[PDB]
Amino acid sequence: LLQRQDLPYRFSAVDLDSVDGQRHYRLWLGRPLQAPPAAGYPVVWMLDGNAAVGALDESTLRRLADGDAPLLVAIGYRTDRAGRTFDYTPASPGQQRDPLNGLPSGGADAFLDLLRDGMRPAVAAQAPLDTARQTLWGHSYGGLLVLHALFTRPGEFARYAAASPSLWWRDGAILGERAGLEQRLRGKRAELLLWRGSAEPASPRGSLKAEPGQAMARLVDDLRRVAGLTLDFQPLDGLGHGETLGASLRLLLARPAVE
C-alpha cells in the first residue's frame, strides 16, 4: 500500500530520533491528492505506526478522499516492544520499570514533547496541518498514552481515540491522572472515543481484581458527565484484544471529520 501510486493518497516517510538517541522513529505520511484547505489538512496521528499502516485498507482510503480528507501520520519505529513500552507509559512520582515485562517505562511525557516539538515540525515541512483539527489514536499501551494526553493536556488534540486502553496498567495508575480534568479542560472542547472487544480479558493477568468490562464501564460512566468532553464508547461484540486495533482504526476513519 505504501508503494502504491494509484490511490487518492500518496505515502512518504520521514525519520526522527528520540532526544536521548535511543529510539528511532519513522513517520509514514499519507497525504490526499486533494489540495489542502486554507487552514491546512486535518491530521490523524496514529501510534503503533507500523501496525497502523497494516490496517489501512483501500476502501477506507478512497472514502476518506471526500473533499475534506485528513493527513494520516503513522508514528512507527525503525527496528518494537522496548520503544513502545517506554514511550507510551506514564511516569510514576519520585525516583521506572514496566510491571509485566520489566522494560524501562515512564517515557510518555518525553514522547508527547517529541510529538509536539519534533514530529509536528517534521510533518509540517511536508504538508500544511490544521492544528485545531487533530486526532490522536492508539491501541493498548497506545490507548494508555492517548488517555494520558487527554488527562494532562486536554484540547491539544480535538479528538482522542483510545482502543482497548490498558486501564489495568500499574494498578489502574491512569485513573489517578483523571483527577482535575474538568479544571484543565475549562474553556476547551474535546472528544474521546473508546473501544473494547467483549472477548477481551480484564488484563493480561486475566481477571483478578475486576470483571472484564468493569474498569471501562466505570471510566465511561465517570467521563460521560464531563462538561466540554464528548464521550463515545463503542463496544466491539466478540472481538478480542488484537482485533480491536484494526477495527477501531477503520471505524475512527469512517467517523465524520473533526470540526
Q: How far apart are CA 258 and CA 255, in angstroms?
A: 9
Resolution value, angstrom units = 2.0
The amino acid sitting at 185 is L
Which residue's entry shows cell 484547505? 37
- CB 219 within 8 Å of CB 175: yes
Q: Cα angle vertex 105, ends 72, 122, to 5°?
A: 30
C-alpha cell read off for 243: 482485533
Among candidates 162, 223, 154, which has minimal Cα distance to 187? 154
Tell me, rounded to whole angstroms, the distance of Cα 212 from its chain centroid.
22
Q: How far apart are CA 63 and CA 48, in angstroms?
A: 23
Q: Which of 140, 164, 166, 248 is catalytic?
A: 140
Q: Side by side, which strands form the sheet with 71-77?
A: 9-17, 24-32, 71-77, 41-46, 129-139, 159-163, 190-197, 229-236
Q: How far apart are CA 71 and CA 36, in angstroms?
A: 9
Q: Is the Cα torsion angle 156, 107, 123, 164 positive or negative in sign?
A: negative
Q: What is the dihedral of CA 94, 99, 103, 109, to 10 degrees?
A: -50
Among candidates 231, 159, 229, 232, which has minimal Cα distance to 188? 229
200 is known as an active-site residue: yes
Which residue's entry shows cell 475512527? 252
Domains of the chain: total = 1
Q: Which of 139, 148, 164, 200 is catalytic?
A: 200
24 is known as an active-site residue: no
Which residue's entry shows cell 515541512? 125
Pairing of strands 24-32, 71-77: antiparallel
Residue 204 contacts by C-beta under 8 Å, 6 or more apart in sequence? 100, 168
Q: Which of 24, 177, 182, 241 is catalytic?
A: 241
Q: Which domain holds residue 187?
A: 1-259
User: What is the 3-class SS of the chain, one letter each residue?
Assistant: CCCCCCCCEEEEEEEEECCCCCCEEEEEEEEECCCCCCCCEEEEEECCHHHHHHCCCHHHHHHHCCCCCCEEEEEEECCCHHHHHHHCCCCCCCCCECCCCCCECCCHHHHHHHHHHHHHHHHHCCCCEEEEEEEEEEECHHHHHHHHHHHHCCCCCCEEEEECCCCCHHHHHHHHCCCCHHHHHCCCCEEEEEEEECCCCCECCECCCCCCCHHHHHHHHHHCCCCCEEEEEEEECCCCCCHHHHHHHHHHHHCCCCC
The amino acid sitting at 199 is A
140 is known as an active-site residue: yes
Q: How far apart are CA 167 and CA 219, in angstroms?
A: 9
